[PDB]
Amino acid sequence: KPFTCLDGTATIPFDQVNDDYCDCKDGSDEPGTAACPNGSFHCTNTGYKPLYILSSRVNDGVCDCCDGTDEYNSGTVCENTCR
Amino acid sequence: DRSNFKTCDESSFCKRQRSIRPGLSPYRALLDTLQLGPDALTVHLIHEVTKVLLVLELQGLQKDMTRIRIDELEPRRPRYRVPDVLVADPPTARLSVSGRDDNSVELTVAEGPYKIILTAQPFRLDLLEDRSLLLSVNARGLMAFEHQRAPWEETFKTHSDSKPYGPTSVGLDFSLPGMEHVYGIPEHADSLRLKVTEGGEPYRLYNLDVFQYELNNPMALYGSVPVLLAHSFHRDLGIFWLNAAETWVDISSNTPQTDIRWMSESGIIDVFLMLGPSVFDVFRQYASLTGTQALPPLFSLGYHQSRWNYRDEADVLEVDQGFDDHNMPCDVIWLDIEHADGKRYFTWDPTRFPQPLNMLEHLASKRRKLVAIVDPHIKVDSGYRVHEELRNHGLYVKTRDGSDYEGWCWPGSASYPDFTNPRMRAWWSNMFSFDNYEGSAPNLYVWNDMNEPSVFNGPEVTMLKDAVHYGGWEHRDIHNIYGLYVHMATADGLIQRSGGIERPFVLSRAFFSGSQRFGAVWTGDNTAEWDHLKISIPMCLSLALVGLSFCGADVGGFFKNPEPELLVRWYQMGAYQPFFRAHAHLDTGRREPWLLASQYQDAIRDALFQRYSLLPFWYTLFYQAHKEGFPVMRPLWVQYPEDMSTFSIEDQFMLGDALLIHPVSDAGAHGVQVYLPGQEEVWYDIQSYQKHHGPQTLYLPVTLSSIPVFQRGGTIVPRWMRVRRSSDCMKDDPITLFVALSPQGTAQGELFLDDGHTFNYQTRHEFLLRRFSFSGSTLVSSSADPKGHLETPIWIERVVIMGAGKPAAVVLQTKGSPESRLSFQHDPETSVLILRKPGVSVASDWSIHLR
Ligand SMILES: CCCCN[C@H]1C[C@](O)(CO)[C@@H](O)[C@H](O)[C@H]1O
Ligand SMILES: [Ca+2]
Ligand SMILES: [Ca+2]
């Protein structure tokens, strides 16, 4: 099946979810990347409070989440500090 | 308070020179003494009354330039010749005697078309292309050369100039037939098109610290570039008066013709005539003499947050966090003089900045930089190691009795290192090593202020004329390059500390011809008022024309508190100017951009996002400035030399040839009048995508968030649409290309890429220069310089085409890949075509076809 933007603006093939290009006006098709200006990246942050961050801070080379999962392809290795 | 500063009448050499009025010159060339040499023609000149003998050295130069030098035949003492400003000995062209009579010798440069006519009596020079007169020298007979007499004493207010060499001033006039518009000779808080000086003061070039300077007047400010450009419908010319002493410039209009007269306190006459014919020819001619804009590290083209002063390390970190908490980008936070130990530079206040390395480490973890101020005045303090070293090694500027000069500045009593001494500059450069400048780190950069030099208890708030420098030269001989030497030694220090790898960033207040090689400048202590916002355009445009492309003004104004609307408009203005820094006086209220009401915050954030989105475009323009000498920010007349209605415009400007900017600069404005030039030219409003045909004056309604910006048809602008918290975060991100189609359905653009901060682009050719071109129905990416290769993940995520119809299909071809189909979106109202995710590496050749 295809994916539908949560705001109903479009329906796209599921291979355009997290394909590093913003296809949904609400940013819902790119929860795991920095592609959308209004998106959010969810940090589970086990051992502390889970956090939402701006999509623009995914792989920006800055450690935003204590669990470090926002930096997975940036050259910055973030140690886990959720303690 | 202007009684602090001499008018021409209160300057005895300006009074003497300016009293000489247009008439029959007493100088005469002795044609019996003429010698035609390998690089030059020399001929003796004589003053008919005084019988003083001078030598004229006349040279044709490669790239259609002429150099005129005049010195005494038998000087009692050597005259000053400006060192370190020319980047090379200019390659010469052979002169030939191609005509002669009783009173004249005609010279040909190489094999033509340029000719120089030397008239013997009265002495005169005329410059021609073929039979067209370009320029005359001494046509009004204003040449004056005060020779060195047997070794006057002068006082101004409470300061005494011993003037041990007496009157030594030099001057010369130039006639520009057909020219009605002249520009340049910064720095003055005055209009772009220079005014006639006939009924008032001459323009003054003497690097001075003017407290609360006022607008629309010819008083000398902090920097001096003795370069004048002349523009007409038919031709462009430039005059480069290579003199480092106090200089006054008279301008008179008289078939239309403009006469220029330079009057300098000492040194020789040394002037370059740059014959164009186009203004870009003039840019190249001047760049070959004094060099080009240093390529800024990318971060320094982002947004700088500054004030006098941030309180301590905690304040600095709070400001850093404030940007991220309010979703506003920023690359650098600045530390003004209160960060040091009582204005002892290279130190840190032990209570408020106890751990600078840890503060710099925290900023590096946000991928941000810091700038620390380092001024050239050194506190007289036996516990201050810098002062003890400079004192012990005799590296200070001296007085005539041989003691070290002492004046007053920020730390109280202070001495001034002799930056004209190469041993002093090497010492200064070595002081920036990470072992010497303790607490500094690779993400700390430098601001040189007060380097005119500013001397609080000195005449005109600067150093005494009869202070003595390296080689025995007087301060009056060298004054206008003192600041440049500070800028240069600081920039060299930032390079050396890295082992020669990192590009520097240094902001300087004082400057001279050649300062473009060492970093950025700004217009000093402006005021939080609407007219100071307006004047930032003509001031930075006058700097751009003379090679200083890395220019800006304090956003919000340095003095006083701007109202929120003025601050919003200043952010919008600054976001489209080369050096983009907010700064403020010690006693102003805090005005970090999130402290405003949300509507003002939002407009400012929008301006910051636009600036960061445009960094690839800015970086390419600076690469083009670095390689070719073309200015980044440009008057409309540079792009439209035949449209006479642009010759004085200074409320509008262009960035390269692609973007026309008209920032709102009036409180409560409901619209602006935008002049869109060019016959058969179209312009795209980048907010609405509406196309407009030139030439017209368009009335455009505005709101608080409006920044009137238009993209020229025929251009392709690269943008990073993923705005992040700093430029370092963005430098691997994909590019969106904005193609604005000409009426012929064409466009072209370039893009420069490298590691963002080293000299590897130069030493290893590690860079990319791409050409993007559109014609027919095909967009092509090719190499504009095959020597450049770069490892980069940057790819093309989007193409936006303005002025295009709906295609039936879109097809991408890239070498190494199968042909692919691209999806797309089209707006019939705006004729805007968006091509989705080409996905091709920016280092790859590729083409997109609209079928
Ligand atoms: C009343 C102060 C006048 C001089 N201002 C200079 C010094 C300083 O104020 C502090 O270093 C800087 O903030 C300005 O930017 C400089 O131009
Ligand atoms: Ca997607
Ligand atoms: Ca991050």
mmCIF file of N, CA, C and O and ligand atoms in Angstrom, chain A residues 12-13 15-24 28-30 33 35-36, chain B residues 836-837, ligand 2:
data_model
loop_
_atom_site.group_PDB
_atom_site.id
_atom_site.type_symbol
_atom_site.label_atom_id
_atom_site.label_comp_id
_atom_site.label_asym_id
_atom_site.label_seq_id
_atom_site.Cartn_x
_atom_site.Cartn_y
_atom_site.Cartn_z
ATOM 1 N N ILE A 12 1.817 8.998 -1.579
ATOM 2 C CA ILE A 12 3.080 8.727 -2.263
ATOM 3 C C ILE A 12 3.411 7.254 -2.082
ATOM 4 O O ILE A 12 2.969 6.617 -1.112
ATOM 5 N N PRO A 13 4.198 6.683 -2.991
ATOM 6 C CA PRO A 13 4.676 5.316 -2.775
ATOM 7 C C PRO A 13 5.501 5.263 -1.504
ATOM 8 O O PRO A 13 6.173 6.228 -1.133
ATOM 9 N N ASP A 15 8.187 3.962 -0.958
ATOM 10 C CA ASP A 15 9.627 4.136 -1.102
ATOM 11 C C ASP A 15 10.037 5.605 -1.104
ATOM 12 O O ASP A 15 11.224 5.905 -1.283
ATOM 13 N N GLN A 16 9.083 6.521 -0.936
ATOM 14 C CA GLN A 16 9.373 7.930 -0.714
ATOM 15 C C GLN A 16 9.185 8.334 0.751
ATOM 16 O O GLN A 16 9.153 9.527 1.065
ATOM 17 N N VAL A 17 9.100 7.365 1.652
ATOM 18 C CA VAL A 17 9.158 7.633 3.082
ATOM 19 C C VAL A 17 10.604 7.484 3.527
ATOM 20 O O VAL A 17 11.239 6.457 3.267
ATOM 21 N N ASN A 18 11.137 8.524 4.173
ATOM 22 C CA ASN A 18 12.543 8.570 4.568
ATOM 23 C C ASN A 18 13.473 8.377 3.373
ATOM 24 O O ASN A 18 14.529 7.746 3.487
ATOM 25 N N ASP A 19 13.094 8.929 2.219
ATOM 26 C CA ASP A 19 13.975 8.892 1.059
ATOM 27 C C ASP A 19 14.781 10.180 0.919
ATOM 28 O O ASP A 19 15.372 10.420 -0.136
ATOM 29 N N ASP A 20 14.827 10.996 1.980
ATOM 30 C CA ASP A 20 15.649 12.202 2.072
ATOM 31 C C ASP A 20 15.184 13.279 1.099
ATOM 32 O O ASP A 20 15.984 14.073 0.604
ATOM 33 N N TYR A 21 13.887 13.304 0.809
ATOM 34 C CA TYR A 21 13.296 14.391 0.053
ATOM 35 C C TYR A 21 11.917 14.649 0.633
ATOM 36 O O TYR A 21 11.166 13.703 0.874
ATOM 37 N N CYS A 22 11.587 15.924 0.846
ATOM 38 C CA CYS A 22 10.347 16.294 1.522
ATOM 39 C C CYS A 22 9.188 16.256 0.532
ATOM 40 O O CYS A 22 9.119 17.073 -0.391
ATOM 41 N N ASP A 23 8.259 15.322 0.741
ATOM 42 C CA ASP A 23 7.099 15.176 -0.124
ATOM 43 C C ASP A 23 5.790 15.600 0.528
ATOM 44 O O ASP A 23 4.806 15.801 -0.189
ATOM 45 N N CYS A 24 5.752 15.741 1.852
ATOM 46 C CA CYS A 24 4.543 16.089 2.590
ATOM 47 C C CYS A 24 4.679 17.474 3.206
ATOM 48 O O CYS A 24 5.699 17.788 3.829
ATOM 49 N N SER A 28 5.497 14.666 7.356
ATOM 50 C CA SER A 28 5.269 13.340 7.924
ATOM 51 C C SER A 28 5.981 12.230 7.159
ATOM 52 O O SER A 28 6.180 11.144 7.713
ATOM 53 N N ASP A 29 6.370 12.462 5.908
ATOM 54 C CA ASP A 29 7.028 11.405 5.152
ATOM 55 C C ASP A 29 8.505 11.250 5.487
ATOM 56 O O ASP A 29 9.123 10.294 5.006
ATOM 57 N N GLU A 30 9.095 12.150 6.289
ATOM 58 C CA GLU A 30 10.527 12.084 6.604
ATOM 59 C C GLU A 30 10.799 12.158 8.106
ATOM 60 O O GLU A 30 11.590 12.983 8.561
ATOM 61 N N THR A 33 14.818 11.755 8.786
ATOM 62 C CA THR A 33 15.835 12.493 8.039
ATOM 63 C C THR A 33 15.684 13.989 8.297
ATOM 64 O O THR A 33 14.761 14.441 8.978
ATOM 65 N N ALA A 35 15.139 16.124 5.785
ATOM 66 C CA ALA A 35 14.666 16.623 4.500
ATOM 67 C C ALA A 35 13.577 17.682 4.643
ATOM 68 O O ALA A 35 13.446 18.540 3.766
ATOM 69 N N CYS A 36 12.766 17.620 5.700
ATOM 70 C CA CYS A 36 11.614 18.516 5.732
ATOM 71 C C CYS A 36 11.847 19.669 6.701
ATOM 72 O O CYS A 36 12.417 19.472 7.780
ATOM 73 N N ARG B 836 11.429 17.104 -8.991
ATOM 74 C CA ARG B 836 11.626 16.398 -7.735
ATOM 75 C C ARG B 836 12.894 15.556 -7.771
ATOM 76 O O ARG B 836 13.117 14.792 -8.712
ATOM 77 N N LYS B 837 13.730 15.735 -6.759
ATOM 78 C CA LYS B 837 14.824 14.863 -6.355
ATOM 79 C C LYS B 837 15.631 14.313 -7.527
ATOM 80 O O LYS B 837 15.597 13.103 -7.772
HETATM 81 CA CA CA C 2 10.007 11.708 0.954
#
